[PDB]
Amino acid sequence: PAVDTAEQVYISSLALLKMLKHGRAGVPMEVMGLMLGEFVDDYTVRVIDVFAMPQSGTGVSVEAVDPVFQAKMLDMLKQTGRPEMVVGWYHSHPGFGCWLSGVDINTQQSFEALSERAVAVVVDPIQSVKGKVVIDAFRLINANMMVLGHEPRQTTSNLGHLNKPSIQALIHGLNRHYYSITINYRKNELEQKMLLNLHKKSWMEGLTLQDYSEHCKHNESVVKEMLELAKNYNKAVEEEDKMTQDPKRHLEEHVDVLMTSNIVQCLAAMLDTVVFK
Amino acid sequence: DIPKGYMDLMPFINKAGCECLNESDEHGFDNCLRKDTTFLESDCDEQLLITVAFNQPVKLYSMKFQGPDNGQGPKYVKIFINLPRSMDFEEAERSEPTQALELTEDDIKEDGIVPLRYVKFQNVNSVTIFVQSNQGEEETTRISYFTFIGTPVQATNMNDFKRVVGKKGESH
Amino acid sequence: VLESTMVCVDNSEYMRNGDFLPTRLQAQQDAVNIVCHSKTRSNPENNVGLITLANDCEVLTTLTPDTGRILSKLHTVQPKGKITFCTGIRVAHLALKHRQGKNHKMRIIAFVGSPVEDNEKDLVKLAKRLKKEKVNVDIINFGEEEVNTEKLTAFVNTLNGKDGTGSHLVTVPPGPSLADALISSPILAGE
Amino acid sequence: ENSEKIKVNKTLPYLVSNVIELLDVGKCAVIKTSTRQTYFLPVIGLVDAEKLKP
Amino acid sequence: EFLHAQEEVKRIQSIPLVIGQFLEAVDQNTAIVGSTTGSNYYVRILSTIDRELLKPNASVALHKHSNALV
Amino acid sequence: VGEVLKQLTEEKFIVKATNGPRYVVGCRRQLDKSKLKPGTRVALDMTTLTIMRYLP
Amino acid sequence: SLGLGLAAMGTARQDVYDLLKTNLYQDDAVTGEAAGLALGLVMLGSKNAQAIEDMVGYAQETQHEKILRGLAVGIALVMYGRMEEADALIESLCRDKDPILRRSGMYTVAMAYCGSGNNKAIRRLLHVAVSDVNDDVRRAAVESLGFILFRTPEQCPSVVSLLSESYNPHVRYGAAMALGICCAGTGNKEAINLLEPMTNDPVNYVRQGALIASALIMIQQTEITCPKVNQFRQLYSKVINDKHDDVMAKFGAILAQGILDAGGHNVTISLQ
Amino acid sequence: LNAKVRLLREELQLLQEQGSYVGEVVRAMDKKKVLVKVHPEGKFVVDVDKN
Amino acid sequence: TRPANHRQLTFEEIAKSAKITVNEVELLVMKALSVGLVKGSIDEVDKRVHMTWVQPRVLDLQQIKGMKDRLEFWCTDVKSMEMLVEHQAHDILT
Amino acid sequence: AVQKVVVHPLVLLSVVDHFNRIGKVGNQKRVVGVLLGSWQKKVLDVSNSFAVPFDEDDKDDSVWFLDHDYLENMYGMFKKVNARERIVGWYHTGPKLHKNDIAINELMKRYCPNSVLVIIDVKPKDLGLPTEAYISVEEVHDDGTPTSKTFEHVTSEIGAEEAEEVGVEHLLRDIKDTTVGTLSQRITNQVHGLKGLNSKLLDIRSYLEKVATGKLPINHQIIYQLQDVFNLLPDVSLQEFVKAFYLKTNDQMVVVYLASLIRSVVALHNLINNKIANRDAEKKEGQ
Amino acid sequence: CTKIINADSEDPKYIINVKQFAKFVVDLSDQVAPTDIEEGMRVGVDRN
Ligand SMILES: [Zn+2]
């Protein structure tokens, strides 16, 4: 048997948010938790929920699982509507990359022995600057796999080569002791709307005018800067036409900003004059 | 009967969770699980609500839920799965089933096997079966046999978590 | 027997009566103590809950096996308001429905020391529902016998149907503390 | 069980540090870690504030 | 999508930066800096950080990771 | 533990931690402003390096 | 099931359809991919309402992406050669929320309006190829465009030249493959001119698509009839023989050699 | 538009790559190996690349 | 009662209302403003009172119906401008 | 009391997930849970939640079994996980209140005297926030109307820590809206503002019509606020406002006109550059 | 080791100075004779 290079760990929206929150809720200590999910068949690992684990001093190791805690919370989740498995464990690496180091391989070996499909997800919450989420999923390579003359994981689809690995992980052996399974976040149509509500602008913000004093100051400043750019532009056009750009591009961006601001505020003003009387 | 690869889900049923609401004390739940002609009777009305629980999630291919052939047999079988709480004969009459079988005498007979929509039963821990109507119309309903045919889903049985490698002191 | 019981306590202001020494409050206290310890003395895994039928029902202890906490949270029950038998018994039914081990037979031991200002038709309808839902009600009828023992008798007879020995109705005439009868009663004699 | 939790979270690679300065906002600390550093602390922690003298 | 990319750049000009002394202009788009940590790194300065005022021996903030002068 | 140095745009401050390194850091909203002037001991956030609350 | 779908291709044999349906009415990705393709092939060009209902229902009701992919191709094949009798299904699929089913819709557009140059279908595909969120569906849109335009090969370079210089690598790969399918076995000089720069594209799968599309275009050609055939043979050899070049690009080069020398230099890929 | 979008994209991708230390070569011992001291830490040998 | 369009109250109007000759309407409006009931200003060169506010009070069903009618008219205006803008900007709404 | 309740995207997603994972296995309508968060002045910050088993009879409307033992154990576990978060109320995913709500709030007031019920509406509406927050108040009414224990509104908002913005941004990057004012987007924003104003005015009118015809009692607070709104309506026919409006409209349009002239000159310059490039290409090709 | 912390009878809880770096309080692991430390005996130590 082999693990295809199309396997994906579909991390749900709730799981991703919980992971990032727990990472920056305990940086620069490391944090750990379980990933309740579902092994669909052989190419899918669905991480439906994640599962914080109390900080226990011994970093993140096998002794940091606290069997009483996990058992009791799994029972309680079962009776509240989560009859889910334990597909792997996530554990943050606060700022020093997304890979594994020794104890991680030992712990993931424990999880695999429990069930040989459990992934291990690593999140770097400091490097997760807004606009880039650094999460990577991993699983081990059998000692009799790369030494017996077999590639770590077969390849039947062109899917597994659309993401390039990072040198940070290469150094620690992204391809000598463990894989890298793709993520492929799974978003419903309701979660996306509920999240859009985060920055959704109110009708008030749509229909509210801009402080006229500040608007006039902005008009004046932009028109002056545009005058300077226009003098430079005259000089540039004369010089280029004589001897045979930055002024033109800056002038274009500034004209854009002035026109958008003025038209928007003027139309808002008329709309209000009609709507509120 | 049993296509290769699928096995009867008797061994994975734990009595810790099995129950059957509205059952006559004369004929108990143990009757439906012997393959003998020992039956289960309805107590008050022409309705019944069985519930079976499995140790590890299982996949259900077919059901052998059959009764006698004297007009006292299940007619409308509503199957729900994975119920957080034991339900009542009032929710059983409106809740949308995961399956809505309407048995016929052919299925009722000893050689009748009713196949379910396999896809909706890919992870089953608890099954509640509501018999809403009898084959004809009898104040008491009777069930002669009931067993599921399917496959078990590989279990990640926590509490088995142990050090398979290394010392007992590494932290990170 | 593997059975889960939901001790319903009437904390109505009618519990102030001292016709059961020292007061009906402590009579009920002792009764609950004895019944809970007897259920424990049965196969221990069996579970006991606690409900109070105040102006509107309330749930003190969801099914737990250690009777210490049931007794501790019983000690602070105080007399307030009146009783709502139908609402209390249905809330107890919900508590049973949310029971971890579904084997445990459903029993509700209700102390009904107050006039049950409910209608006989509603009581029989609720009895029919419980009979279909496999609930066994043991009523400790102590207090306004003539006012409500008729309705309680109809309720328990409906529950029993024709041979339904599960549900019982023990009427305790005024006398000593409300335990001596219970220690030898059909509900507890088998236990 | 809370004592057991505190014991489990009191592993024993502690860093030796000073208590250079103290403040009240409750009690706080401005400890100076031997690894030459100065770390502020809102909740003084497991120390019972036995006057925690500088 | 161009607007989104421009915003991503404006974001790379982040707030939590670490200060250090820009030393020299190695080539086009790239330069050598010495952080206030005391160590020197070689990085690529973001587009249009006023390479007029990025004179040698300059005070400059750096992206905590990649130490890029921004 | 560090000291502001220059008070960049009112959402930013150059703070020199004890061990020496200097960072442009944020300003916690409830912290208020105008209380952090060059030399104000502050309790920088350990990771986001934000001025959490001042000190004597 | 793949073999039976191939064998009964076209024939609507109810017995084969029932066997394939029984196989698909389980849940293994491997069985499902083949079962879906086989159902589509067996019901090819029959617009069987029962088959479409069953396939779309199972597609919405399963949880295996692979079965979904197979069902996508199958549904597309079902509306084969039915120009406007597919509009309902095409709209349903293109509005659906599962990206594999939106891809099913685009393949349905292709296999319905196969070789009819229908501007309605082309507008649908070209709109999606820029207004979709899943690159897997953008690529399918461009490839379907390719299928639509093959009775007028001269035109495909026009539609695909603007796509080929796109920042989306999936759209680039779809452009390459659309050129291949359109100008298959035609050696279109404009097509080869558009593909030649793409062979030095910094993304491996676009390189692969360029190589395979070039093979399809130049299949069974000599130097006189096309001037760049030797150039591309040497390019395939170099891509294979390089050590830095990517594995998938090597895969594309190998398949390109195979296609170019297909059938002992005695076979051509002519959709008509 | 495509040109400018692609330029910005590549700029971001290449600028998200970690920097590199600057040291001084004590002596180039052997081909492809250099003994270089990197401030302020000690001196290491390297694995000089191919470019 | 008066809407904002012509909420300018004239001294003669006040005098014809609560019966006081117009040389202490100034004091009446003075006390009204002082107590905090009505905000605004007095412009007595032209003999007018600009009331910009009123102490909201508890109304009757008839008054609430009046407010409902005014809301209806206001809604009609808003919907009209809404339709106009959406119809004239149909090509630039993302 | 508490004025503001800022809920978090994690709370919202958790509620959605609870509703889905129970509705899939049954049909319960409501799903009920506890909210965990922290105070800062009078500004509640709800930053987590968790389901608590619930079951009620939709007929009787006073029989329900919120499970306080489960609540306590679950809160113990989350207290171990993170301690700067104490129970700050509850939530239920029902579009409207229910009779039980006051009793459930009385139950939860045991664990938080200041309880905030956030009715998180799973169904995605297109005009309003999905959270509406309430707090229980019993007080002798000033108007002398008989007093009963009923809810009072507390302002609600959605805000996020940076650790959650990094997630929401990534999840929504596919269907995101540019965080900059493109003129089309701004005109769209104004159209949406008019949509919302119309919706709110329709709501007010419907309520006033119901009040007038009598199907509802009069709420003095609502009437106060409405007559204050009318109080605040502005005047536009006033002359020294029409003058000012014309003045600033003209100033804005001078800026616009200068912008347009600059754009025209730049466009002509680019046209000339291109014509010259083509002329050179043609001449070179000819020679 | 600079101060054996009085050994607290059981659980000695040794201390150590890594000099320029730091001063740690430490335990004994795998050491057969947990007395052969002599309070200054230049003991062994692990990284983390
Ligand atoms: Zn690790």
The set of residues, in sequence order, having a beta carbon less than 8 Å from that of A207 and lying 6+ positions away, is A268, A271, A272, A275, J190, J193, J194, J196, J197
A91 is in an annotated binding site: yes
* Same domain? J162 vs J237: no
Say how far apart CA F26 and CA J208 lie, in whole Å: 49
Q: Tokens representing G172?
A: 């680039």
Angle (CA) E32-E36-E38 rounded to 5° is 75
Calculate how far, in angstroms, residue B172's C-alpha sits from the geometric centre of ligand 1: 6
Contact B171 K48 (CB under 8 A): yes
Say how far apart CA C70 and CA C63 lie, in whole Å: 9
As to burial, measured by CB atoms within 10 angstroms (0-12 exposed, 13-18 middle, 19+ buried), residue A250 is middle
- Residue among J228, A275, J220, A272 nearest I52 (CA): J228
* Same domain? J39 vs J137: yes
* Same domain? J172 vs J245: no
Q: Specify the pairing of strand B48-63 against strand B114-115.
A: antiparallel
Quick check: do J and C touch, 3+ CB pairs under 8 A? yes
Q: Tokens representing J84?
A: 């700067």
How many separate helices (H) and strands (E) can be counted in chain D? 1, 5
Quick check: do G and H touch, 3+ CB pairs under 8 A? yes
* Same domain? J77 vs J138: yes
Contact list in J for residue E4 (CB cut-off 8 A) is: 176, 178
SS3 K37: coil
The set of residues, in sequence order, having a beta carbon less than 8 Å from that of A178 and lying 6+ positions away, is A100, A105, A108, A120, A138, A139, A140, A141
Contact with chain J for residue I69, Cβ under 8 A: no
Residue whose pair of structure tokens reads 């347009």 in the numeric block: J260
SS3 K25: strand
- Contact indicator for C107, C136 with CB cutoff of 8 Å: yes
SS3 J105: helix
Length reported for chain F = 56
List strand residue ranges (DSSP E) for chain B, in order: 7-8, 19-21, 40-41, 48-63, 74-81, 99-102, 114-115, 124-134, 142-143, 148-152
Last-in-domain residue among J132, J153, J182 = J182
Provide DSSP, G80-97. Answer: -S-SSTTHHHHHHHHH-S
Buried b / exposed e along J186-205 (16+ C-beta atoms within 10 A): bbbbbbbbbbbbbbebeebb
Would residue J34 count as lying in a domain? yes
- In this structure, the number of other CB atoms found within 10 A of the CB of residue G271 comes to 12
Contact with chain H for residue A132, Cβ under 8 A: yes
What is the radius of gyration, based on Cα positions, of chain I? 20
Contact list in A for residue J73 (CB cut-off 8 A) is: 72, 76
Would residue A148 count as lying in a domain? yes
Domains in chain J: how many in total?
A: 2
- Contact indicator for C61, C49 with CB cutoff of 8 Å: yes
The set of residues, in sequence order, having a beta carbon less than 8 Å from that of G136 and lying 6+ positions away, is G99, G100, G103, G170
* Same domain? J161 vs J266: no
Instruction: Identify any residues that bridge with J90 across adjacent strands, giving them in sequence order.
Output: J34, J117
The set of residues, in sequence order, having a beta carbon less than 8 Å from that of B74 and lying 6+ positions away, is B48, B65, B67, B103, B108, B131, B133, B134, B135, B141, B143
For A60, phi then psi, to 5°, come to -140, 95
Contact list in E for residue F12 (CB cut-off 8 A) is: 15
Strand order through the sheet with D32-33: D17-18, D32-33, D37-38
- Residue among J53, E18, I12 nearest B84 (CA): J53
What is the distance in angstroms between the CA of the first residue and the CA of the last residue of chain C? Answer: 9
Last-in-domain residue among J182, J215, J249 = J182
State the best of I5, I85, I93 to mutate against chain A, taking most chain A CBs within 10 Å: I85
- Contact indicator for E46, H15 with CB cutoff of 8 Å: yes
Residue whose pair of structure tokens reads 């109110």 in the numeric block: A202
SS3 B32: helix
- Domain with J244, as residue range(s), is 223-282
C52 HSE (CA, 13 A, CB side): 24
Say how far apart CA E31 and CA E69 lie, in whole Å: 8
Say how far apart CA J231 and CA J243 lie, in whole Å: 23
- Contact indicator for J46, J118 with CB cutoff of 8 Å: yes
Would residue A1 count as lying in a domain? no
What is the experimental method? cryo-EM
Would residue J275 count as lying in a domain? yes
* Same domain? J164 vs J33: yes
Q: Tokens representing G251?
A: 């895969």
Say how far apart CA G17 and CA I51 lie, in whole Å: 83
Q: How far is I47 from chain A (nearest CA, A)?
A: 26
SS3 G164: helix
Q: Specify the pairing of strand F50-54 against strand F22-27.
A: parallel
* Same domain? A103 vs A211: no
Say how far apart CA A251 and CA E26 lie, in whole Å: 31
Would residue J201 count as lying in a domain? no
Contact I70 J230 (CB under 8 A): yes
To 10 degrees, the CA torsion angle through D41, D42, D46, D48? 110
- Domain with A249, as residue range(s), is 207-270
- Residue among C122, C114, C119 nearest C139 (CA): C114
Length reported for chain E = 70
The set of residues, in sequence order, having a beta carbon less than 8 Å from that of G46 and lying 6+ positions away, is G12, G78
Residue whose pair of structure tokens reads 């019981």 in the numeric block: C5
Would residue A277 count as lying in a domain? no
Say how far apart CA A97 and CA F13 lie, in whole Å: 28
Of the candidates B57, B155, B163, the beta carbon closest to that of A110 is on B163
* Same domain? J151 vs J255: no
Q: How far is B171 from chain K (nearest CA, A)?
A: 9
Provide DSSP, chain C. Answer: --EEEEEEE---GGGG--SSSS-HHHHHHHHHHHHHHHHHHSSTT-EEEEEE-SSS-EEEEEEES-HHHHHHHHHT----S---HHHHHHHHHHHHHT-S-TTSEEEEEEE--S-----HHHHHHHHHHHHHTTEEEEEEE-S-HHHHHHHHHHHHHHHHTTT-TTSEEEE--S-S-TTHHHHTSHHHHT-
What is the distance in angstroms between the CA of the first residue and the CA of the last residue of chain E? Answer: 23
List strand residue ranges (DSSP E) for chain F, in order: 2-4, 13-17, 22-27, 41-44, 50-54
Would residue J197 count as lying in a domain? no
- Residue among G84, J221, I63, G57 nearest B120 (CA): G57
Instruction: Identify any residues that bridge with B131 across adjacent strands, giving them in sequence order.
Output: B48, B77
Of the candidates E35, E37, E61, the beta carbon closest to that of F24 is on E61
Strand order through the sheet with A89-91: A8-11, A44-53, A32-39, A89-91, A120-123, A135-138
Q: Is the dihedral of CA J145, J149, J151, J154 positive or negative?
A: positive
- Contact indicator for I61, J208 with CB cutoff of 8 Å: no
Say how far apart CA G213 and CA J282 lie, in whole Å: 34
- In this structure, the number of other CB atoms found within 10 A of the CB of residue H7 comes to 12
Contact list in G for residue B122 (CB cut-off 8 A) is: 27, 63
Domains in chain A: how many in total?
A: 2
Last-in-domain residue among A141, A163, A196 = A196
Would residue J204 count as lying in a domain? no
By CA distance, what is I89's nearest residue in J?
A: J187
Residue whose pair of structure tokens reads 């149907």 in the numeric block: C161
Q: Is the dihedral of CA G6, G11, G13, G17 positive or negative?
A: positive
F13 HSE (CA, 13 A, CB side): 29
Instruction: Identify any residues that bridge with E22 across adjacent strands, giving them in sequence order.
Output: E33, E58
* Same domain? J149 vs J267: no
Contact list in C for residue B85 (CB cut-off 8 A) is: 97-98
- Contact indicator for B161, A67 with CB cutoff of 8 Å: yes
Say how far apart CA A197 and CA J13 lie, in whole Å: 11
Contact J80 A266 (CB under 8 A): no
Contact G25 B118 (CB under 8 A): yes
Buried b / exposed e along G163-180 (16+ C-beta atoms within 10 A): bbebbbbbbbbbbbbbbb
- Contact indicator for G79, G121 with CB cutoff of 8 Å: no
* Same domain? J174 vs J228: no
Instruction: Give helix A67-80 / helix J68-81 axis angle, nearest 10°.
Output: 140
Contact list in K for residue B169 (CB cut-off 8 A) is: 29
Would residue A261 count as lying in a domain? yes
- Residue among C114, C103, C88 nearest C12 (CA): C114
For A267, phi then psi, to 5°, come to -65, -40
The set of residues, in sequence order, having a beta carbon less than 8 Å from that of B137 and lying 6+ positions away, is B46, B71
SS3 D41: strand
What is the radius of gyration, based on Cα positions, of chain E? 12
Q: State the DSSP H helix or E strand holding residue J269, giving kind and residue range, or none if neither.
A: helix J239-286
Say how far apart CA J75 and CA J36 lie, in whole Å: 9
State the best of A4, A158, A182 to mutate against chain G, taking most chain G CBs within 10 Å: A158
Would residue A202 count as lying in a domain? no
Q: How far is D32 from chain K (nearest CA, A)?
A: 11
Contact list in A for residue D9 (CB cut-off 8 A) is: 55-57
Instruction: Please enumerate, as own/partner, the contacts of G268-272 that have beta carbons within 8 Å and a separation of 24 or more.
Output: G268/G185, G268/G219, G268/G220, G269/G184, G269/G185, G269/G216, G269/G219, G270/G184, G270/G185, G271/G114, G271/G115, G271/G150, G271/G181, G271/G184, G272/G115, G272/G150, G272/G151
Q: Specify the pairing of strand C168-171 against strand C135-141.
A: parallel
A93 is in an annotated binding site: yes
Instruction: Kindly list the residues of chain I whose beta carbon comes within 8 Å of any beta carbon in chain A.
Output: 5, 77-78, 81, 85
Instruction: Identify any residues that bridge with A35 across adjacent strands, giving them in sequence order.
Output: A50
Question: Running DSSP on this structure, what letter comes out for residue G99?
Answer: H
Provide DSSP, J145-201. Answer: PPP--EEEEEEEEE---HHHHHHHHHHHGGG---SS--HHHHHHHHHHHHHHHHHHH
- In this structure, the number of other CB atoms found within 10 A of the CB of residue C178 comes to 24
To 10 degrees, the CA torsion angle through G78, G84, G88, G94? 80
- Contact indicator for E44, H15 with CB cutoff of 8 Å: yes
Q: Is the dihedral of CA J270, J273, J279, J285 positive or negative?
A: negative
For B81, phi then psi, to 5°, come to -135, 145
* Same domain? J171 vs J244: no
Would residue A114 count as lying in a domain? yes
Contact G63 B122 (CB under 8 A): yes
SS3 J264: helix
Peptide bond preceding C22: is omega within 30 degrees of 0, i.e. cis? yes
Instruction: Give helix G49-61 / helix G65-78 axis angle, nearest 10°.
Output: 160
- Contact indicator for B122, A46 with CB cutoff of 8 Å: no
| A243: region left, alpha or beta (phi > 0 left; psi from -120 to 50 alpha) | alpha
* Same domain? A118 vs A172: yes
Contact J70 C91 (CB under 8 A): no
Q: State the DSSP H helix or E strand holding residue G179, giving kind and residue range, or none if neither.
A: helix G169-182
Would residue A92 count as lying in a domain? yes
Last-in-domain residue among A162, A196, A230 = A196
Would residue J192 count as lying in a domain? no
For B85, phi then psi, to 5°, come to -130, 150
- Contact indicator for B77, B65 with CB cutoff of 8 Å: yes
- In this structure, the number of other CB atoms found within 10 A of the CB of residue F29 comes to 10
State the best of A207, A272, A274 to mutate against chain I, taking most chain I CBs within 10 Å: A274
A124 is in an annotated binding site: no
In G199-272, which ranges are continuous DSSP H helix? 204-218, 229-241, 247-260, 262-265
* Same domain? A97 vs A169: yes
Q: How far is B81 from chain A (nearest CA, A)?
A: 11
Longest dimension (CA), chain J: 101
Q: Specify the pairing of strand D37-38 against strand D32-33.
A: antiparallel
SS3 G27: coil
The set of residues, in sequence order, having a beta carbon less than 8 Å from that of C163 and lying 6+ positions away, is none
Question: Running DSSP on this structure, what letter comes out for residue G153?
Answer: G
- Residue among C148, C140, C163 nearest C115 (CA): C148
- Contact indicator for F36, F6 with CB cutoff of 8 Å: no
Give the neighbours of chain A: at least 3 Cβ pairs within 8 Å: B, D, E, F, G, H, I, J
What is the distance in angstroms between the CA of the first residue and the CA of the last residue of chain J? Answer: 87
Q: Tokens representing D52?
A: 């925690």
* Same domain? J177 vs J228: no
Of the candidates J25, J27, J53, the beta carbon closest to that of B81 is on J25
Resolution in A, one decimal?
A: 3.3
Q: Tokens representing C43?
A: 């196969």
- Contact indicator for G202, G210 with CB cutoff of 8 Å: no
* Same domain? A39 vs A160: yes
Last-in-domain residue among J182, J209, J231 = J182
State the best of F45, F47, F49, F50 to mutate against chain A, taking most chain A CBs within 10 Å: F47
Length reported for chain G = 272
SS3 H44: strand
Q: Tokens representing B77?
A: 């079988």
Three-class SS of chain A = CCCCCCCEEEEEHHHHHHHHHHHCCCCCCCCEEEEEEEECCCCEEEEEEEEEECCCCCCCCHHHCCHHHHHHHHHHHHHHCCCCCCCCEEECCCCCCCCCCCHHHHHHHHHHHHCCCCCEEEECCCCCCCCCCCEEEECECCCCCCCCCCCCCCCCCHHHHCCCCCHHHHHHCCCCCECCEECCCECCCHHHHHHHCCCCCCHHHHHCCCCHHHHHHHHHHHHHHHHHHHHHHHHHHHHHHHHCCHHHHHHHHHHHHHHHHHHHHHHHHHHHHHHCC
By CA distance, what is A135's nearest residue in J?
A: J167
* Same domain? J177 vs J231: no
Q: State the DSSP H helix or E strand holding residue I41, giving kind and residue range, or none if neither.
A: strand I40-43
Say how far apart CA C150 and CA C162 lie, in whole Å: 18
Would residue J211 count as lying in a domain? no
Provide DSSP, J32-83. Answer: EEEEEEE-SSSEEEEEEEEE----B-TTTSS-B---HHHHHHHHHHHHHH-S
Calculate how far, in angstroms, residue F36's C-alpha sits from the geometric centre of ligand 1: 39
Q: State the DSSP H helix or E strand holding residue I51, giving kind and residue range, or none if neither.
A: strand I48-51
* Same domain? A153 vs A37: yes
Say how far apart CA G100 and CA B65 lie, in whole Å: 38
The set of residues, in sequence order, having a beta carbon less than 8 Å from that of B38 and lying 6+ positions away, is B27, B30, B31, B32, B144
Question: Running DSSP on this structure, what letter comes out for residue D34?
Answer: T
Q: Tokens representing A269?
A: 């003003």
Q: Is the dihedral of CA F16, F19, F23, F26 positive or negative?
A: negative
The set of residues, in sequence order, having a beta carbon less than 8 Å from that of I84 and lying 6+ positions away, is none
Say how far apart CA A160 and CA G204 lie, in whole Å: 12
* Same domain? A128 vs A254: no
- Contact indicator for A180, A165 with CB cutoff of 8 Å: yes
The set of residues, in sequence order, having a beta carbon less than 8 Å from that of J208 and lying 6+ positions away, is I64, I65, I67, I68, I71, J226
Q: How far is B122 from chain G (nearest CA, A)?
A: 8
Last-in-domain residue among A146, A171, A196 = A196
Say how far apart CA A76 and CA G191 lie, in whole Å: 63
